[model samples]
Each structure stands twice: as C-alpha cells, then as structure tokens.
Target: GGPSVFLFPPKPKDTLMISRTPEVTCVVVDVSQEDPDVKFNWYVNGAEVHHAQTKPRETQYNSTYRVVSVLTVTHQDWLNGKEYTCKVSNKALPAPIQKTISKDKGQPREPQVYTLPPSREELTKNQVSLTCLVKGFYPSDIVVEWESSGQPENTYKTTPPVLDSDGSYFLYSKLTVDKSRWQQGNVFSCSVMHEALHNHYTQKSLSVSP
Candidate 1:
C-alpha cells in the first residue's frame, strides 16, 4: 500500500499559535512490502526551504518493512500570517501529501463545563465518562485537563475546537473513570487553560452518587 503521512498540532485546520519560535516535525510511514523511493520538501509561504533536514529510519515486522521519514523544521522563515507546508512524495502515492500551518491572533476566553452520564454498558463495566464543553473561546487555542479530587488524570481524549458562526470556538474533552470510584463521592473536574486567563484557569467539578 501507499505511505501514511501525518502532521502534528493537528487542530484548527491549518492553524497554529506560538509564543516564540517552534520546530514542527512531519512523520511519514511507508508500509509497503518493498522499499519505496520517497522525497521530502519543506516550504514557507509558497517558497522552498532548502536547509531543512530529512532523516530515515526503518523497522522490520512480520515479513513487512516499515520505513519512516522525519522532516525537521527549523526557525520560522516567514513572519506570522504566512504558511508552512510539508510535502511528501513516494512511489506508493499517486500524488504528494501536503500539510500546511498558519499563524493565528491571540484571543482567549473562559470555557463552560459539562459532565455527562455513563451509558448502560459503561455502568455495567464500572466506567463513567466526563465531558467539558468549552464555548465562545477565541483564537481557537485552549488546553483541557481532567482532575479527580484535586489530582490530575493523565489519560483522556480531547477534541479540537471547532469554529462557530459568530467567530467564537467550541471544543470538548472527555474522561472515562471507574464507576466505583465515582460512587465513592470522589469529585471529578475539568480545568481549562487559555492565554486570555492571565495565568489562571477556569474549572468546574461534579460529584456523583450511586
């Protein structure tokens, strides 16, 4: 088959914000049976970046070989409001894969929180889900984390913020927890971090009973 390529910071659909300079990496995985010729290119605002580096690493798994290519991005070439693209070409692909990035203005807003109930199967499995809905935020940049009785839970899933019709943004983060622990009166909460908050976070919590 063809190579699978992905770009990081995969949110806001071709948009990213940085306080300072940042390095973005592109990863390409070729899962074909045979070795395929691949090439990588980096561009900033439609102009080619000549000094970028491409590194290759390979692994063999169960009669098949997986080849990976890493494209390293250096300092910001063009200023903000410009574009950055990573292009990959390989024999397995009919066309080149392109990933783009652009800068965004800094605007932040507090988020609203919601905690959803567990499904029937989840209750039987002793698992519950928590959701934090952040609405009307700006700049589309925010962080969501889960906490159980003041402690952080590292494993959770969060969705990228979607732009609303009013130019605001909406996003959600979900956390799954054990129903037994929830029924024990442990408090669960969602905390949001945004640039507009001035080094503070907006938080909400819920306590459940069996």
Candidate 2:
C-alpha cells in the first residue's frame, strides 16, 4: 500500500438543455471532444432545417419530440419566443448552447377512483363468488378485469398491497363467475385498469339475478 489514488463520480452534463412541450421545441447540440469532425447542423432562424415533423398535428404520446438531426422540419412556428439553433463540433462551440421556447396553455388533472367488487345475486347453479375491493390510491398501478356475458369465460385474481394504518394502501381483486352468467341474467363486469396513469377506470355494471 504505497501508491494509490482513485476518485470517480461526475459525468452527467451532456444535456445541452432540454425542457420541451409548449407546442414542441427541442434543440440540443453538444459534441466537442476537442473539435474537428464536421457534419451536424440544424438551424431555424438561419434557414437550414430537418427534424420536427408533427405534421397536421397528429402526434400525441407524452406529446412529440423524437426527430434526429441533418435538417428536419415540421415546425409550426414555435410561437412567442422561438429560437432553435444547433451546430456541432466543426463550429467548435461557436454556438455550443443557445435556447428559447415559450407557449403555454394546457392544464387538466383529477381522475383516480377505483372501487368495485361487491354485487351478487344468486338463484342457484354454482352459486356465486366474487371479491373485488380496490380502495383509494397512492401509486401502485392497478390491473383487474373479469367480464362474462353471452359466453366467454374469464376469472382473474391479483392482490398486491400490504401496509395499512392510515398511511394509505390496499389492493385486492378476486373474481369467479360461471353461475351461467349470473343465472342467465347475463352482464357481469369488474374492471379496474390503470396501466400507468389514467384512462380506463370503469366499474358500474354489477347485475346478477337467478
């Protein structure tokens, strides 16, 4: 143990500057090892584009921003404060970093309610057994679906959640239907799907009579 020196932890500064979504705007150009490799340019105010195709506005998925360099265009005037410029290496940091993006008007949030699994009516024929109780939320990602009607069997069970004292967290889903679709009455639903965030939170079709 006579000669030793090692220290590492500091390599996350290659993001020229990106924070888009006002309508769409992403300009990042930073490639300078020492400078001298030419070929990599994109300008909006100097006329030389290629990369920004939102065309007729039909791109929505976290909302646009996935086009690569070499003159790409589809910019509908970034509106208000628009100035995108990215000219790499050869420019030798001539414009290493310069940004401007402005245009805001979109805000809507309020939808998270999943409670289903307690509605049964029997007249005989295998009886009935369904237990679907999903209460409240606090990030756990839900998924429980069981629908039967006309003729297309289904029975799924998934329970994930353990930690309750009032902090908030409880998940359970168990469905078993085959009582001839609720004694021929038909129409059974126990749905609760929160794939990742929202859209598809339904539960209001529990009719069983036999």
Candidate 3:
C-alpha cells in the first residue's frame, strides 16, 4: 500500500571496524507499487558523498517497483575507522530513513564466574539467595541461566550486561530458593553461554550448609 524502504549492512549494536583490504558496500532500497519519487544520500562521518550511484529502477511481474542506490567505500576510506551512513527519502514518508556503521573496539572474550552464597540472616528466614557474577567479557552478548540438580529453573534475576572502562562487560544473575530445598541436598548452578566460547558454557556451582 505504502512505500517500503530499507537500508543495508543492518544495524549492529556492538562496535564494528571495516577492513582495509576490501571495499565496503552500502545500499538503500524502496520496494513498493506506488512508484513514488525516491531519493538517496550517502555520508561518511556526517559528511556527504556525492558519488553514490542510483541504480536503474526495475519492476516485478506483479507490478511492484524497486528503486535502489549503492555506495562504495575504498580501502583508504575505512582505514581511519570512520562512520558510514545511508539515507533514504521518499514522498510517501514524512522523514528520511538512515542507517550507519562505525568502528568497533572490542572483541569476544570469555567470561569469569564468581558465586556468592546466602548470608546467615537469610538462612534463618527459610530463604537462600545465590548470586553469580560473570565478569571480564566483551561484545556484551551473553546468556545466563539457572539450574537445580542439573534441571533448568525459571526462577532467577539477571542484570543487563554493563560495559566496563576497559571495554569489557560485567553481568550478574541471582537465584533465590527455599532454605528447605537447599537443605535437601539440591545443588544450584549458574551457566553462561556466549559467542566467545562457542559450543561450551562456563558454570559455577554452590550448595548451602550450616
């Protein structure tokens, strides 16, 4: 019904740096049947690049129109870790659609685990809180889960990964269980999965005792 626009090199939340050996490519496209006037613009760190090419518009068998624009970045342009952006505008929309790419300074790193047991006060109240701290990781994408007696459990509180001064990341996941269950010899463990350790997970185990 309306003009649909998209920008390529999809947004990545983490830092990304382009290589100097190959040219980087960017694209903007509008796929719609409306045949509305579409425009494209390219930028590097906010400065305009006038050499961007507007490809020949094409039509599909169903009568849908396809408009595209392409931008090419040479090796020298990406050597300095600059930002690259693509902007798409059309009469069917109120505002322009923009996408960007920038340098990424951090890479994937394995996370370390630390376990904290419940305090004496907590034990007296028939509750035990177990905290697992995962530290010194990078790229920020990680999965933390809790298990009791080797079975997965849904009861846990996980904090959002936090960035550190050195560009690493830290995260914490806590599980609270009834003291009676812990006293019954149930073993609680925290497991972490991340890209840094593909096909493997780092875990910490804890059991409560008087």
Candidate 4:
C-alpha cells in the first residue's frame, strides 16, 4: 500500500537553450497494493490551471507506477510572482500531497552581460545589429536598454527571456545602427538593469573601426 507524490516546477534543460514553455514536473509514485490511478491538479495562486496532462509508466519491482505530468505556466504568471502548485489526491490515501514553487523557493544567481556583433552572414549589410546577451540570472526582474554615443536607441528588439535547466535564465536584445557610426568608431552600449546588480546598470559596449 504505497503511493507518494513529488512536485517540482520549471525544471532545467540538458543544454543551455532558450526554452519558451517552462516545464513543471509532477511525479506520483504508486505501489502494487495501492490504487493504480492517481489524480493531478495544477494551480496558480489558488486559481486552477487545467491544461496539464499526464503520462504514466510502470516498472516490475512491486509494480511501481509513475505518473509524470509536465505542466507549463505562462510567462506572466511566472514573472508576476505567483505560486504554482500541484495537488495529488487518491482514495487509498488518508490525505493529499501538495507542493509548490515560487521565487521564495528559488535562489538568486548573478547575471552576466556581453555585447556581440551580428552574425557573420549579417555583417555585410549597411545596417548593423548589435546583440546584447544576458545569461544565468534568476528572480527575473531584469531590464535591457540600448544606447548609441550615449543617446537612447529607438530601433531595437528584445526577445522574451527564457529559463535554463539549471534554474537560471538568459535573453538577448538587438540594437540597429548604421555602418557610418561603426566605421567612425562610435561606442554602442547595452545597459542591463537588475536588482542583483549594484550600479545603475551592468553595461556592455561594442565598437568597430574602419
């Protein structure tokens, strides 16, 4: 008569790739003597998140049943500091098991910033794209802004931040400027703003000469 529940959110990846749908894992283990089917309910801040589905697997030792539910939460919910929880309930048990994850359950890591040029294939164009890479940050309150010769840049794009498998995050932004500025050696800067950073910004700058 054995059934156990485990819940963990926003698991890490095998490689440091950009992940869009952050996965939360729900694992429920059941023994031969217990009811085979288990219930999994995912919630966010007391509100039900009904989109999650489960896959079950079984092994021969005491006939253990493992139900793995990979749940995905919205970026808004995750970034807005809402709690995500899983409730596991069954008739064979006296009580249900509930586990959750939030900023409180996570640790903060320092952010790294770098300024890179456009890809080799993109380098020939008259317009230049300056890339700002921000990696390995946590607790999610970070901002990126671009400036050219100390003036704020108007044409730029920032990708949505993605979480890494190591419980950290990474993102990049691009600033577009013309070749004349780069040829003249004007400095282009990307300023990263985060609570973990002490200064007004952790800035990375790039310049190219004729």
lDDT against the true structure, per candidate, is: 0.65, 0.41, 0.69, 0.73
Query: Ranking by lDDT, best first?
Result: 4, 3, 1, 2
Off by over 4 Å in 4: 1-105
**Residue 78: error of model 3 in Å?**
19
Comparison by TM-score, 2 against 4, better one: 4
| Candidate 2 TM-score over all chains jointly | 0.21
Every model's TM-score: 0.50, 0.21, 0.55, 0.50
The lDDT of model 3 is: 0.69
lDDT string, candidate 1, 91-181, tens digits: 7778888987655654455555566655566677767786777788776767777887667987689998898897888887888888787
lDDT of 4 by residue, 1-210 (tens): 657777775632211223446667888876444566777788877778577878756565765666788777665455456887889888778888888876444666778998897676877889988888998887555778888777898999988778888888889998888877666778889888664565525778888744
**For model 3, where is the 10-residue window of minimal lDDT?**
10-19
Candidate order by TM-score, decreasing, is: 3, 1, 4, 2
For candidate 2, the per-residue lDDT at 34 reads 41
Candidate 1 has an lDDT of 0.65
Error of 1 at 99 (Å): 4.9
Spell out the clash pairs found in candidate 4. Answer: 12-165, 13-165
Residue 210 displacement in candidate 4 (angstroms): 7.3
Tens-digit lDDT track of model 2 for 1-210 = 011111111111111112222223332223233432334344556556455332222222532322223223222353222344544333544333433222222221222434343344443547466566665543343455666654434566768754456544456666666666555666666666442234435553555433
Question: Clash pairs of candidate 2?
Answer: 49-71, 49-72, 50-71, 50-72, 51-72, 51-73, 123-210
